[PDB]
Write an enzyme that holds these catalytic residues in place. Structure first.
Site, mmCIF file in Angstrom:
data_model
loop_
_atom_site.group_PDB
_atom_site.id
_atom_site.type_symbol
_atom_site.label_atom_id
_atom_site.label_comp_id
_atom_site.label_asym_id
_atom_site.label_seq_id
_atom_site.Cartn_x
_atom_site.Cartn_y
_atom_site.Cartn_z
ATOM 1 N N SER A 59 0.716 -1.267 0.037
ATOM 2 C CA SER A 59 0.013 -0.107 -0.050
ATOM 3 C C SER A 59 0.897 1.203 -0.035
ATOM 4 O O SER A 59 0.155 2.489 -0.169
ATOM 5 C CB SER A 59 -0.840 -0.072 1.207
ATOM 6 O OG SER A 59 -1.867 -0.858 1.034
ATOM 7 N N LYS A 62 0.290 3.357 -3.032
ATOM 8 C CA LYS A 62 -0.738 4.613 -3.255
ATOM 9 C C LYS A 62 -0.083 6.093 -3.070
ATOM 10 O O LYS A 62 -0.881 6.663 -3.789
ATOM 11 C CB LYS A 62 -1.753 4.384 -1.916
ATOM 12 C CG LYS A 62 -2.689 3.051 -2.041
ATOM 13 C CD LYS A 62 -3.599 3.101 -0.860
ATOM 14 C CE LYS A 62 -4.448 2.092 -0.950
ATOM 15 N NZ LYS A 62 -3.986 0.886 -0.345
ATOM 16 N N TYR A 145 -10.517 3.079 4.995
ATOM 17 C CA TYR A 145 -9.559 2.540 3.965
ATOM 18 C C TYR A 145 -9.804 1.793 3.182
ATOM 19 O O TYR A 145 -10.563 0.888 3.408
ATOM 20 C CB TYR A 145 -8.162 2.431 4.886
ATOM 21 C CG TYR A 145 -7.002 2.255 4.125
ATOM 22 C CD1 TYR A 145 -6.660 1.216 3.434
ATOM 23 C CD2 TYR A 145 -5.975 3.403 3.793
ATOM 24 C CE1 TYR A 145 -5.465 0.975 2.694
ATOM 25 C CE2 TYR A 145 -4.833 3.171 3.413
ATOM 26 C CZ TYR A 145 -4.503 1.798 2.911
ATOM 27 O OH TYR A 145 -3.397 1.645 2.176
ATOM 28 N N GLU A 266 -0.164 10.327 4.509
ATOM 29 C CA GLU A 266 -1.112 10.759 5.753
ATOM 30 C C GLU A 266 0.034 11.493 6.619
ATOM 31 O O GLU A 266 1.331 11.187 6.587
ATOM 32 C CB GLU A 266 -1.470 9.479 6.383
ATOM 33 C CG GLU A 266 -2.489 8.633 5.711
ATOM 34 C CD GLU A 266 -2.757 7.117 6.188
ATOM 35 O OE1 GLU A 266 -2.439 7.052 7.312
ATOM 36 O OE2 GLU A 266 -3.265 6.272 5.438
ATOM 37 N N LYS A 309 3.533 6.331 5.170
ATOM 38 C CA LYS A 309 2.744 5.557 4.651
ATOM 39 C C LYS A 309 3.108 4.067 4.902
ATOM 40 O O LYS A 309 4.335 3.902 4.780
ATOM 41 C CB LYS A 309 2.400 5.606 3.236
ATOM 42 C CG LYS A 309 1.448 4.819 2.588
ATOM 43 C CD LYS A 309 0.008 5.035 2.967
ATOM 44 C CE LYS A 309 -0.945 4.114 2.479
ATOM 45 N NZ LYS A 309 -1.209 3.067 3.139
ATOM 46 N N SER A 312 1.954 -3.376 3.045
ATOM 47 C CA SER A 312 2.293 -4.914 3.173
ATOM 48 C C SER A 312 1.427 -5.673 2.244
ATOM 49 O O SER A 312 0.490 -5.171 1.538
ATOM 50 C CB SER A 312 1.563 -5.389 4.389
ATOM 51 O OG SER A 312 1.736 -4.420 5.588
HETATM 52 C C1 LIG Z 1 -1.594 -2.281 1.719
HETATM 53 O O1 LIG Z 1 -0.477 -2.570 1.852
HETATM 54 N N1 LIG Z 1 -2.732 -3.070 1.638
HETATM 55 C C2 LIG Z 1 -4.227 -2.356 2.016
HETATM 56 C C3 LIG Z 1 -4.319 -2.289 3.450
HETATM 57 N N2 LIG Z 1 -3.096 -1.369 3.926
HETATM 58 O O2 LIG Z 1 -3.434 -0.826 5.371
HETATM 59 S S1 LIG Z 1 -2.088 -0.763 5.869
HETATM 60 O O3 LIG Z 1 -1.142 -0.123 5.323
HETATM 61 O O4 LIG Z 1 -2.362 -0.228 7.290
HETATM 62 O O5 LIG Z 1 -1.626 -2.319 6.144
HETATM 63 C C4 LIG Z 1 -3.941 -3.720 4.161
HETATM 64 C C5 LIG Z 1 -2.806 -4.288 3.820
HETATM 65 C C6 LIG Z 1 -2.544 -4.473 2.269
HETATM 66 C C7 LIG Z 1 -3.527 -5.430 1.420
HETATM 67 N N3 LIG Z 1 -3.426 -6.501 1.949
HETATM 68 O O6 LIG Z 1 -4.153 -4.886 0.546
#
Ligand SMILES: *C(=O)N1C[C@H](NOS(=O)(=O)O)CC[C@H]1C(N)=O
Length: 356
Positions: A59, A62, A145, A266, A309, A312
């Site tokens: 993420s 983004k 989110y 953020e 940011k 994962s």
């Molecule tokens: C981002 O890496 N994805 C969306 C979401 N991100 O929120 S986090 O940065 O607080 O982890 C969850 C993890 C990930 C995904 N599995 O799509």
């Protein structure tokens, strides 16, 4: 009190508790990057982690998507307050006649979920999903989110310039940012550099294609390239339009606690407490809908602030933080998806040392 000892002190507990196979740390301070590397890219190959190893940043992608979006604004593709359906006629007579492009980017359209339903596995099913979606909240009032939310933002932003997202990212934005080791799909010549992720079951894993994966979570990059991108976000790009795009990502739209939601990034006032930084990155903010404290109008957020940011994937865990006024940036890339709170605490310790 040397940097190297501060980084070791912060990182070793992570490596230990979470059995992290490989971690690349990059610190930008006084206008120079410094690299600290630990472990292995692939437990079944000899090559050690370096600042050239490619990691899935999840993420954190983004922030790249946001910058593509603001580049499209700079080039006249859309305005942030345009209705989504202006740029997606297939969404006429849907929620998206009332939702703005900015609300997509800031996860405030009205309850788009974290992920697409599993059944959404094609362009046509994606289009139908958005057409059918019934809001949970009025537009702008709640932050939830959402990969579908910013995914649609990136998809539509690129479409306003007449290009697929992957093309615009790979042929315009990344080259103008001078990022030569940053990919939505790793080419054959770079595969030697691509780490494997290690899942919570200790298995080697890589990200697979998914709907709007490029936009939401698909970048692979090195610590050297990612700290270069952090530097661009502090001291700038020599490309005028890209610089305008980078600056515009600092536009804040609302706050949740001490966190202000911008485009991709953020941010927090700096100095910032550890408690505030943990709270803004906690599940209570990340995985629950929160009512926002709205701004009267979108506001460019300043230099005396900490931007961050998390991201994962299966088997990977990334975190990026920077404070423009202090000239300090930190990138932490790992091939274990280890707890966000631990990422934050370690980065916070390093930052407190380099920007007391
Ligand atoms: C981002 O890496 N994805 C969306 C979401 N991100 O929120 S986090 O940065 O607080 O982890 C969850 C993890 C990930 C995904 N599995 O799509």
């Amino acid at each position: 009190e040397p940097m190297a000892n501060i980084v070791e002190k912060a990182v070793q507990p992570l490596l230990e508790e979470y059995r992290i196979p490989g971690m690349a740390v990059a610190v930008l301070k006084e206008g120079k990057p410094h690299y600290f590397n630990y472990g292995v890219a692939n437990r079944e190959s000899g090559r050690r982690i370096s600042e050239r190893t490619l990691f899935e940043i999840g993420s954190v992608s983004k922030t790249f998507t946001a910058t593509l979006g603001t580049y499209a604004v700079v080039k006249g593709g859309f305005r942030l307050d345009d209705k989504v359906s202006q740029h997606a006629p297939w969404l006429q007579n849907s929620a998206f006649d009332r939702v703005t492009m900015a609300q997509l980017a800031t996860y405030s359209a009205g309850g788009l979920p974290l992920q697409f339903p599993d059944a959404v596995d094609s362009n046509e099913r994606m289009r139908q999903y958005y057409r059918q979606w019934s809001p949970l909240y009025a537009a702008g009032t709640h932050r939830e989110y959402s990969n579908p939310s910013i995914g649609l933002f990136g998809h539509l932003a690129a479409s306003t310039l007449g290009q697929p997202f992957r093309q615009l990212m790979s042929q315009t934005l990344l080259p103008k940012l001078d990022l030569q080791h940053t990919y939505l799909e790793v080419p054959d010549a770079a595969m030697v550099d691509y780490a494997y992720g290690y899942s919570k079951e200790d298995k080697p894993v890589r990200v697979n294609p998914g709907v709007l994966a490029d936009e939401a979570y698909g970048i692979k990059t090195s610590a050297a390239d990612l700290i270069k991108f952090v530097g661009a976000n502090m001291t700038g790009s020599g490309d005028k339009a890209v610089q305008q795009a980078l600056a515009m990502t600092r536009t804040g739209f609302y706050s949740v606690g001490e966190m202000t939601q911008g485009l991709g990034w953020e941010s927090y006032a700096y100095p910032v407490t550890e408690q505030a930084l943990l709270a803004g990155n906690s599940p209570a903010v990340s995985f629950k809908a929160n009512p926002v404290k709205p701004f009267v109008a979108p506001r460019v957020m300043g230099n005396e602030r900490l931007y961050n940011k998390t991201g994962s994937t299966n088997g990977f865990g990334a975190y990026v933080v920077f404070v423009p006024a202090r000239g300090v940036g930190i990138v932490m890339l790992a091939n274990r998806n280890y707890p966000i709170e631990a990422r934050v605490k370690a980065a916070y310790a390093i930052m407190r040392h380099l920007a007391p």
